[PDB]
């Protein structure tokens, strides 16, 4: 028992270090003598059937141009990535969706202005890993308002000789969302349009290393990332050349699921600036009839406020919504949602109640559209939605 | 399909408001004309078989003494409560464990000094709810270093005529942990030892209300909370008089489980000040052989840093450790823990490796004690711990 107590106590401490050190954030610092920045970070690539392959990243960025750029105070980028496949694509490929935000500093230039909308992206990579030459082309778009990248990459030489996850960091940090109060620390956009050179060494623990040099710049209205990669000293049946790295998980939100959350987000972010402020959150809650104090509104946002900017951005909203609930918690959540829709609390959402809720949220739907929502949910043909019918629409 | 899309989009927005507004924090503001404070908060009491009973709290505190107290800027308290039963207690009772911390303001007085250790607590309550008179006595201790209360309450008049959860807020906020940078906002300790009067109105939605007046002061070295409660207009078979409120859940950490996490916490908090600083976290990680930058250490703490003080307190540590993992995540966590113990990575934790890990964590164990840990884990009698043996000790 005392021995058991000792294993538990020290087990907890060791697992606590594991939980704390689970982050894979990109730490950025100025490099004033090169008029640019350096970064360091550690990617943890899951190995098939358990374990992690560590990839230690050392990064340097220097502007192509001769002029002023923003040299930042220390801060970091936080990345959410989702890798998937196109079922209609026969070539070796990767579909990638990424959300990237800056943080670590507590509470419009010509470079900034280039990123205020959706920007087309081209990526070209020529690689040579242990003598295996290969090429990758990618295209898609970046929307820095939401820190969002959506891209599809093809191996144009045939089968990719390394796992796709090992190339993600190499294959445009100018698309990261920097909150307003960190705008003076955004080196990446400040170097645009002439662009920057991004170089890395990536050391795969107990295995080989990649050395990468990329030119990141606008060519016309397209942001282009042109990359040369060299890998050396890889083990022929290590995790990289032996393709023993997990591609993704079954347990990840779909691109279209994320898209539905983006539509929900826009109901709060009515000015489309990519943030929900206390004013905006209160506006919606007040329209639904609730009355939060400024203190409650500040605290509610603070709870999910990863970067401490006092607002909810889309990646923060996604984190909150992506969180899976205990099935008993989920039930109570749906029960509470029903209560919001059933305004008079009589156990039935009427068509009139549903029209009002749509109006209060800021949805614009015709009465006919609302009737179609009623028809979709109604099982017993009374033209109203009871609790169990509502559960089917929330499930 | 379009109708379905509409239910999903608006469902997400409504559930998002539910997730955001799930907090039950205690909002405190100064009341300068009464030389004290006011507070407002909304408790959500789970109803048996689903739903919530709301209890709207309005609070006022005024010092008993004539002298100076600290009148705070706006801030809040965050509470974790665990209600349980004593299997050896035959009377109607409640065992309560609470952790309370202050937050909401961004980065030793004689009153403060009274709370630097463990302080005995007595609680006395005389109540009268719809004419039903009853009394409650409680005793235990408070340890503000960890924001911790542990108390047991007995109904001394027989059966309690209201549910125990409805009395928790009434039955010593001087035991809240205020971080160093908020010390000038701690009204509760500043009024000690002469104490304060705490008054509330508590409105149970669609039901009756409690009016409470309490005197909170030291009597000798004991912190005493003496309370008069009056309830009126309750519904005879509403949720309160009808006893339809859930007492607790099966899914809560045990008092002794929490105690094991406290022992683990003390390995990092080697100076016993109730916080883990970047210096302390780095010290342990460096002893285990790891090398985090100051940036990594700051970021790791920030991730779990509820109050933004730059350190991990015990309730923050508990939140991190209490979080339940997907069984696949838990497996990888245990795999990674094994790797920390198996220093040379050969698949076996030797006795010598285990002795070193104990030393590196700052555990003080004899070689004999370490041998007993080996014996506890060893299934195949080689005197070492392989991975599957280790899994049995982590499970
Ligand atoms: Ca906005
Ligand atoms: Ca934010
Ligand atoms: Ca209704
Ligand atoms: Ca119906
Ligand atoms: Ca400490
Ligand atoms: Ca903290
Ligand atoms: Ca070993
Ligand atoms: Ca063994």
From Swiss-Prot, chains A, B:
Record note on biotechnological use: Green fluorescent protein has been engineered to produce a vast number of variously colored mutants, fusion proteins, and biosensors. Further generation of mutants led to more stable proteins (at 37 degrees Celsius for example) with brighter fluorescence and longer fluorescence lifetimes.
Effect of residue 172 to L: In EYFP; leads to yellow fluorescence, folds faster and more efficiently at 37 degrees Celsius and has superior solubility and brightness
Keywords assigned by UniProt, alphabetized: Chromophore, Luminescence, Photoprotein
Pfam families the UniProt entry points to: GFP
Impact reported for residue 209 to T: In EBFP1.2; shifts the excitation and emission spectra to shorter wavelengths and increases quantum yields compared to BFP
Effect of residue 184 to R: In Azurite; shifts the excitation and emission spectra to shorter wavelengths and increases quantum yields compared to BFP
Protein name: Green fluorescent protein
Organism: Aequorea victoria (Water jellyfish)
